[PDB]
Ligand binder design. Structure first.
Ligand SMILES: [Ca+2]
Ligand SMILES: [Ca+2]
Lengths: 269, 168, 269
């Protein structure tokens, strides 16, 4: 049996304020529903999920969490944005789908602090935020999704990005290139071309082919289209080159979103 | 190491391969409104809008986020220990008269020891830095102080004057 | 990890030409995305999937592949038509859903030739065709879907079709009766009425009840509505009668589509 709780009131919710959603340790957080009003998702900046003071996932703005959910075609409702720790799209290969999905839940056992920090923009009309938690029996943090932010310059022509962090033992579920002039992209590991120079229209067709929604000004490289976690990129301690070849038409700075995965460690990624 | 940081509009990424100045005091320079970041294993953020002394963290590359495109270049000198303090105080007074002659001439020389000069000219006098010229009796790069006006200069560098173009 | 490749250019793509998509042997083809322009799907006739020169699946026109995907409610996009070897609707009974779906993938190991032949109509404006392959590790052809074409005269009254091929060991996933005047149909094996004389409206209701889309002028007899492969007709060597009783209102020529299934054999069905 799961428990649906109305989280404690968020302290000091005001424009230009730096607030935090301190989660009580002991149980497992499958989903966290954040209700907002008097402020836009884009006005909720620097969203950071911290476990024991360390960064797990990061969102430039709350709007990126809305887009993250939209991509998987999850239920979107105005005035509310959810933190899906449990991945509903997961499919089991040697285990049940339910086990593969729940395996991403935010367990807090052994944790000292679990926080969701963020900054409220100064332009916020009259910010009002509350949270509800869908919890289950306590478990260690274990397998978690770690959304990381990276900024790189794209040229009009061909740009290559090979300096992406490769935490050993971790995996890569997907890579999202946020740019308005990306025509095609190619992904390779150690010379091996896992993703040919696929045109945007072709890449976007495959995405939609798997029930995903194409995000505006974004080139998504989904490594878990089938929902199989074993299809994701395994950051082998032996990989020599993890490269991305981007064919752009504009000269801009792209925001590269990398969805990492791995067993959370107090001294890990 | 003393390193440049210039502007244009978008993100900048100056990644010199050696964070010897990791566990080190940064003498970072800052204009108007920016955001920065620390990349040395972990990807971190930073927001700072005034000249500040920073402490040590890990660094292989620097992130440079931009809000205002048209701010100004800086030199973020990261050093193990960086302490710079000295204004004075003046112990000595010396009073004397300068010889005002023709054309642009030096009023005061570069002199590391000078703190302050209080000056009064008996004639209208144009005062400026090394750019001041007076091609044809017309002063450029100067400003006038009036005859009998007491004024002060608090620099330690050259100052120049002009009063007249008459040789005799 | 899967590999997305931009297949080699299709040779001699022109109106009235007979082209072929020669697939490189070695790996497994889960899906093949065929992009088309300057030609209609109906203008791409006699589509044949051949393994080692032998026929696997056949489509009168590329439009039949579009309808095949539409029926399962798969993502349809104008200018592109996919060959879904892996059946996304499959559900596992004693294995995972993923295993049951991937089991239909087009493995090429041991093959000498893998081709997708077709003819470009003469009326084609300015045919332009390209293909992309979603591949995975190599496997034998193994369990494959074998789409077969049959033409039979349908009367106004009652017609019976009992001469459908019954390859031993093979199965029948579904039967599609393409006619405009079919009122009701009855299916029986050895006297046993597995499908009562169901009215079109009633049959179509059950189809939609399982997330399927009803095709125009078609009476579909889906034997895998639940996605369970073991619900399909098992063509036992002992079966004495496999009959179809069609109640039509028109005198016409029907195109009977039979989706067979079985382990591919170089000298089999
Ligand atoms: Ca977990
Ligand atoms: Ca197969």
């Amino acid at each position: 049996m799961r428990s649906f709780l109305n989280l404690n009131s968020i302290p000091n919710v005001a424009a230009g304020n730096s607030c935090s959603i301190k989660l009580p340790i002991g149980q497992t957080y499958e989903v966290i529903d954040l209700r907002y009003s008097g402020v836009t998702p884009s006005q909720i900046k620097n969203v950071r999920v911290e476990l024991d003071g360390r960064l797990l996932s990061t969102y430039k703005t709350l709007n990126d969490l809305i887009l993250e959910n939209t991509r998987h075609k999850r239920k979107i409702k105005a005035g509310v944005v959810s933190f899906h720790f449990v991945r509903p799209e997961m499919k089991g290969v040697n285990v049940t789908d339910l086990v593969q999905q729940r395996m991403f839940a935010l367990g807090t056992v052994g944790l000292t602090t679990c926080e969701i920090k963020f900054d409220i923009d100064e332009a916020a009309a009259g910010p009002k935020l509350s949270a509800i938690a869908q919890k289950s029996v306590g478990t260690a943090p274990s397998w978690l999704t770690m959304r990381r932010n990276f900024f790189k310059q794209l040229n009009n022509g061909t740009t290559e990005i090979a300096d992406l962090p490769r935490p050993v033992g971790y995996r890569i579920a997907a890579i999202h290139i946020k740019a308005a002039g990306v025509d095609a992209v190619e992904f390779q590991i150690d010379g091996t071309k896992w993703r040919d120079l696929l045109k945007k229209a072709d890449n976007d067709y495959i995405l939609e082919q798997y029930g995903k929604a194409v995000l505006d000004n974004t080139y998504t490289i989904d490594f878990m289209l089938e929902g199989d976690v074993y299809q994701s990129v395994l950051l082998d301690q032996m990989i020599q080159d993890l490269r991305l070849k981007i064919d752009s038409t504009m000269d801009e700075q792209a925001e590269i979103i990398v969805e990492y995965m791995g067993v959370w460690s107090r001294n890990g990624f | 190491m003393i390193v440049k940081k210039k502007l244009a509009a978008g993100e900048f990424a100056e990644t010199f391969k050696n964070g010897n100045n990791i566990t080190i005091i940064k003498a970072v320079g800052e204009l108007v409104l920016r955001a920065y970041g620390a990349d040395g294993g972990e990807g971190l953020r930073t927001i700072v809008r005034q000249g500040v002394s920073i402490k040590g963290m890990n660094y292989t590359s620097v992130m440079l986020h931009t809000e205002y495109a048209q701010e100004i270049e800086y030199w973020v000198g990261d050093l193990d220990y960086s302490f710079q303090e000295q204004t004075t105080k003046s112990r000595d007074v010396n009073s004397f008269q300068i010889p005002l002659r023709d054309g642009v001439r030096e009023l005061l020389p570069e002199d590391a020891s000078r703190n302050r000069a209080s000056i009064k000219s008996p004639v209208d006098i144009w005062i400026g830095g090394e750019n001041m010229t007076a091609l044809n009796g017309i002063v450029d790069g100067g400003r006038k102080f009036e005859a009998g006006q007491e004024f002060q200069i608090n620099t330690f560098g050259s100052v120049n004057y002009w009063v007249s173009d008459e040789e005799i």
